[PDB]
């Protein structure tokens, strides 16, 4: 029952999703950061072919 891993970075200059813009924020916090979820759906896209 092995798992999968993914290389998650933390950014600081992002393109806002509310508008057409760009934002900055402070560097990350000092300490341990955890986060638990469970994907329940997703978004795909076809590919024009024959």
């Amino acid at each position, epitope marked *: 029952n092995d798992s999968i891993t993914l290389p998650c970075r933390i*950014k*600081q200059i992002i393109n806002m999703w509310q508008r057409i813009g*760009q934002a900055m924020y402070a560097p990350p916090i000092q300490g341990v950061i955890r986060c638990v979820s469970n994907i329940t759906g997703l978004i795909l896209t076809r590919d024009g072919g024959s």
Partner: antibody, heavy 128, light 110 residues
């Protein structure tokens, strides 16, 4: 690292406006911040203000605010300072400084404040 | 207005000996301070950043520490080319309003 060459020293008549340059060379240009600091002969250091390239935004000093203007240009890899209403009380030596920041182009950035590399320091004589 | 002051107004000490300097703040500046030495007429040099660590490519005989409003730098054993004026500088506040210290003159105790 990078190297910061400057322009040639200058003399300006009072009540004028001065422009001064500083060129950097040695590494990818955006990934470094920049700052301008000056010193009168044998005195402390006068923090003038700084600029962030990747966003191209500059911050200025409170009691200097109004007659200052920093600017940059990613094409030619240079930095310009301009100062307005020249007054003889500002003859001094000037320095352009920088510091690495991180993978800006990929959205990483840490906004350091201190000053790693240094230029020589041009001289400006405002006087009669 | 946040203001720092160097101390003493002048330190003097002979070779083989240690120098001690203390920078003074007006509020709590958590870990934002830096130390540069300037030989007269020369481009200054970065010694201590983060107020707790040493630069790269620099002799290990320097070290500082401190917090709150009191900071310090000490060098245990002077050498022949440590004769320069020394400045402390903070970069804490945002929006950025940075400021520089006075600078203290250091010549041999002789």
């Amino acid at each position: 690292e990078v190297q910061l060459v400057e322009s040639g020293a200058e003399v300006k008549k009072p009540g004028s406006s001065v422009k001064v340059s500083c060129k950097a060379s040695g590494d990818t240009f955006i990934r470094y911040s920049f700052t301008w600091v000056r010193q009168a002969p044998g005195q402390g250091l006068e923090w003038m203000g700084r600029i962030i390239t990747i966003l191209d935004v500059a911050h200025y000093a409170p009691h200097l605010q109004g007659r200052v203007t920093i600017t940059a240009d990613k094409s030619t890899s240079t930095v310009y300072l301009e100062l307005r209403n020249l007054r003889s009380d500002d003859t001094a030596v000037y320095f352009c400084a920088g510091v690495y920041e991180g993978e800006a182009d990929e959205g990483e950035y840490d906004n350091n404040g201190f000053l790693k590399h240094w230029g020589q320091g041009t001289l400006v004589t405002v006087s009669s | 207005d946040i203001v720092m002051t160097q101390s003493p107004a002048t330190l003097s000490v002979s070779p083989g000996e240690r120098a001690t300097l203390s920078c003074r703040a007006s509020e709590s500046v958590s870990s934002d301070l830096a130390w540069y030495q300037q030989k007269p007429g020369q481009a200054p040099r970065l010694l201590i950043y983060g107020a707790s660590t040493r630069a790269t490519g620099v002799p290990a005989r320097f070290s500082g520490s401190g917090s709150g409003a009191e900071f310090t730098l000490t060098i245990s054993s002077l050498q022949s080319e440590d004769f320069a004026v020394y400045y402390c500088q903070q970069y804490n506040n945002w929006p950025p309003r940075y400021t520089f210290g006075q600078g203290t003159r250091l010549e041999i105790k002789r």
